[PDB]
């Protein structure tokens, strides 16, 4: 701008983050526990013990 | 009394295990000393017989 003259921006932008699209993750061993949180499983174990 | 001792110690051990898994450190610290006392009491048999925690012959002693 010190040596030329600009116009008002015709397109405003900024820095941003590019990532690879999340894919269907390869199922993990012990993915059969995913429907319930770990805390539920531990409470189940200790309720079994207590009962 | 002999038939009734193991449940107490093992249930207290269950308490200790539960508080370990839950990561409740303070209560586990408060409970470890009694755990070790029970362990020592059960596995020492200070009585010379060393066959039962309470022995009818050794029992009836005032001490």
Curated annotation (Swiss-Prot), chain A:
Tissue: Detected in forebrain. Detected in dendrites of neuronal cells. Expressed in the pyramidal cell layers of CA1 and CA3 and in the granule cell layer of the dentate gyrus.
Transmembrane segments: 38-51
Domain of life: Eukaryota
Post-translational modification: Palmitoylated. Depalmitoylated upon L-glutamate stimulation.
Upregulating conditions: Down-regulated in the pyramidal cell layer of CA1 in the hippocampus by global ischemia.
Location(s) in or outside the cell: Cell membrane; Postsynaptic cell membrane; Postsynaptic density membrane
Entry text on domains: The M4 transmembrane segment mediates tetramerization and is required for cell surface expression.
Family: Belongs to the glutamate-gated ion channel (TC 1.A.10.1) family. GRIA2 subfamily.
Cited function: Ionotropic glutamate receptor that functions as a ligand-gated cation channel, gated by L-glutamate and glutamatergic agonists such as alpha-amino-3-hydroxy-5-methyl-4-isoxazolepropionic acid (AMPA), quisqualic acid, and kainic acid. L-glutamate acts as an excitatory neurotransmitter at many synapses in the central nervous system and plays an important role in fast excitatory synaptic transmission.
Subunit structure, interactors included: Homotetramer or heterotetramer of pore-forming glutamate receptor subunits. Tetramers may be formed by the dimerization of dimers. May interact with MPP4. Forms a ternary complex with GRIP1 and CSPG4. Interacts with ATAD1 in an ATP-dependent manner. ATAD1-catalyzed ATP hydrolysis disrupts binding to ATAD1 and to GRIP1 and leads to AMPAR complex disassembly. Interacts with GRIP2. Interacts with GRIP1. Interacts with NSF via its C-terminus. Interacts with CACNG2, PICK1 and GRIP2. Interacts with GRIA1 and SYNDIG1. Part of a complex containing GRIA2, NSF and NAPA and/or NAPB.
Other remarks on this protein: The postsynaptic actions of L-glutamate are mediated by a variety of receptors that are named according to their selective agonists. This receptor binds AMPA (quisqualate) > L-glutamate > kainate.
Name of the protein: Glutamate receptor 2
Source organism per UniProt: Rattus norvegicus (Rat)
UniProt lineage: Eukaryota, Metazoa, Chordata, Craniata, Vertebrata
Gene this chain is encoded by: Gria2
From Swiss-Prot, chain B:
Transmembrane segments: 10-30
The organism's place on the tree of life at top rank: Eukaryota
Localization, UniProt: Endoplasmic reticulum membrane; Postsynaptic cell membrane; Cell projection, Dendrite; Cell projection, Dendritic spine
Segments on the Cytoplasmic face: 31-63
Tissue: Brain. Expressed in the neocortex, hippocampal formation, and cerebellum (at protein level).
Assembly and oligomerization: Acts as an auxiliary subunit for AMPA-selective glutamate receptors (AMPARs). Found in a complex with GRIA1, GRIA2, GRIA3, GRIA4, CNIH3, CACNG2, CACNG3, CACNG4, CACNG5, CACNG7 and CACNG8 Interacts with CACGN8. Interacts with GRIA1. Found in a complex with GRIA1, GRIA2, GRIA3, GRIA4, DLG4 and CACNG8.
Function recorded in the entry: Regulates the trafficking and gating properties of AMPA-selective glutamate receptors (AMPARs). Promotes their targeting to the cell membrane and synapses and modulates their gating properties by regulating their rates of activation, deactivation and desensitization. Blocks CACNG8-mediated resensitization of AMPA receptors.
Homology family: Belongs to the cornichon family.
Name the record gives this protein: Protein cornichon homolog 2
Entire protein: shown range: 64 to 126 of 160
């Amino acid at each position: 701008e010190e040596v030329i003259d600009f116009s008002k921006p015709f397109m405003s932008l900024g820095i941003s983050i590019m990532i690879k699209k999340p894919q269907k993750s390869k199922p993990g061993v012990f993915s059969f526990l995913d429907p319930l949180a770990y805390e539920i499983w531990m409470c189940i174990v200790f309720a079994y013990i207590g009962v | 009394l002999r038939k009734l001792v193991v449940p107490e110690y093992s249930i207290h051990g269950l308490f200790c295990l539960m508080f370990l898994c839950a990561a409740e450190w303070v209560t586990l610290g408060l409970n470890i000393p009694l755990l070790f006392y029970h362990l020592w009491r059960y596995f020492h048999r200070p009585a010379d017989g060393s066959e039962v925690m309470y022995d009818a012959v050794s029992i009836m002693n005032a001490d």
